[PDB]
Amino acid sequence: KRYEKLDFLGEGQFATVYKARDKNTNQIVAIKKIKLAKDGINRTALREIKLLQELSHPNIIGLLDAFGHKSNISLVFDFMETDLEVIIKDNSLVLTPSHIKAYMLMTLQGLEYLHQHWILHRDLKPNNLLLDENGVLKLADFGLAKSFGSPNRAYTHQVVTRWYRAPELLFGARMYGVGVDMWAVGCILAELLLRVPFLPGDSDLDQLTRIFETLGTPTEEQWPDMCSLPDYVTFKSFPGIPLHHIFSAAGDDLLDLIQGLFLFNPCARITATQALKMKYFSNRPGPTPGCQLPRPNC
Amino acid sequence: YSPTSPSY
Amino acid sequence: LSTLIEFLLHRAYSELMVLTDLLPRKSDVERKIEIVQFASRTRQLFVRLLALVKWANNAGKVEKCAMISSFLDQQAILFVDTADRLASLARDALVH
Amino acid sequence: NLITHYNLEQAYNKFCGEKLSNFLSLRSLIEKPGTMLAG
Amino acid sequence: MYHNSSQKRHWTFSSEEQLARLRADANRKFRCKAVANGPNDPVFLEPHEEMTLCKYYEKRLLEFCSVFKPAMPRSVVGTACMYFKRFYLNNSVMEYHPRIIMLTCAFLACKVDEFNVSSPQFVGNLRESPLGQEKALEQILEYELLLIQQLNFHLIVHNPYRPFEGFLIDLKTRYPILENPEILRKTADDFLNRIALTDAYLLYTPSQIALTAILSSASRAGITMESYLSESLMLKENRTCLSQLLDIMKSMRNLVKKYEPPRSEEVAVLKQKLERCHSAE
Amino acid sequence: ALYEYQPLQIETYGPHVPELEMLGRLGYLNHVRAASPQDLAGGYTSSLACHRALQDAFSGLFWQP
Amino acid sequence: MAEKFDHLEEHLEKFVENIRQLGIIVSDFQPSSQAGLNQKLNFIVTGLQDIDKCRQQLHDITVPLEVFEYIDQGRNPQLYTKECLERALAKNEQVKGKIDTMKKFKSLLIQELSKVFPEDMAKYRSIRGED
DSSP string, F4-44: ---------BSSPPPPSGGGTTTTGGGGSPPPPHHHHHTT-
User: Which residues on B lie below 8 Å from A161 (Cβ)?
Assistant: 3, 5-6
CATH of E6-156+261-279 among 3.90.1170.50, 3.10.129.10, 1.10.472.10, 3.40.190.10: 1.10.472.10
Cα A273 to chain centroid distance, Å, stands at 16
Distance CA C60, CA C73 (A): 20
Q: Do chains G and B touch (3 or more CB pairs under 8 A)?
A: no
Is residue A181 part of the annotated active site? The answer reads: no
User: Which residues on A lie below 8 Å from F7 (Cβ)?
Assistant: 273
Distance CA A121, CA A103 (A): 17
The shortest CB-CB distance from C68 to any of G48, G51, G88 is to G88
Catalytic residue among A123, A141, A181, A204: A123
Chain A's closest residue to E8, CA to CA, is A54
The shortest CB-CB distance from A161 to any of B1, B6, B8 is to B6
Distance CA E106, CA E268 (A): 23
Chain A's closest residue to C22, CA to CA, is A5
Domains observed in chain A: 4-81 (3.30.200.20), 82-297 (1.10.510.10)
Distance CA E253, CA E258 (A): 9
Is the separation of the CB atoms in A133 and A81 below 8 Å? yes
Return all residues near E84 (Cβ < 8 A) that are at least 6 apart. E54, E57, E58, E61, E98, E101, E102, E105
Chains in touch with G (3+ beta-carbon pairs under 8 Å) read C, D
For residues A268, A269, A272 and A273, what is the CA-based torsion angle, rounded to 10 degrees? 20
Residue type, E118: S
Establish whether A14 is an annotated binding residue: yes
Return all residues near C77 (Cβ < 8 A) that are at least 6 apart. none
Distance CA A289, CA B2 (A): 32
Distance CA C43, CA C37 (A): 9
Tell me which CATH code domain E160-258 carries.
1.10.472.10
The shortest CB-CB distance from A53 to any of E137, E144, E154 is to E154
How far off is chain A from E148, nearest CA to CA, in Å?
9
Is the separation of the CB atoms in F60 and E208 below 8 Å? yes
Mutate to test the interface with C, among A1, A8, A9, A36 (most CBs of C within 10 A): A8
Is the CB of residue A6 less than 8 Å away from at least one CB of chain C?
no
Chain G's closest residue to D8, CA to CA, is G81
Domains of chain E, residue spans: 6-156+261-279, 160-258
DSSP 8-state secondary structure symbol assigned to residue A287: P
User: Which residues on A lie below 8 Å from B1 (Cβ)?
Assistant: 200, 202
Given resolution (angstroms):
4.8
Is the separation of the CB atoms in A203 and B3 below 8 Å? no
Whether A53 and E6 lie within 8 Å, measured CB to CB: yes
Phi first, then psi: what are they for E258, rounded to 5°? Answer: -85, 0
User: What method was applied to determine this entry?
Assistant: cryo-EM
Is the separation of the CB atoms in A121 and A161 below 8 Å? no
DSSP 8-state secondary structure symbol assigned to residue B8: -
Contacts across the A-C interface (CB distance below 8 Å): 5
Is the CB of residue E166 less than 8 Å away from at least one CB of chain F?
yes
How far off is chain C from D17, nearest CA to CA, in Å?
16
Establish whether A10 is an annotated binding residue: yes
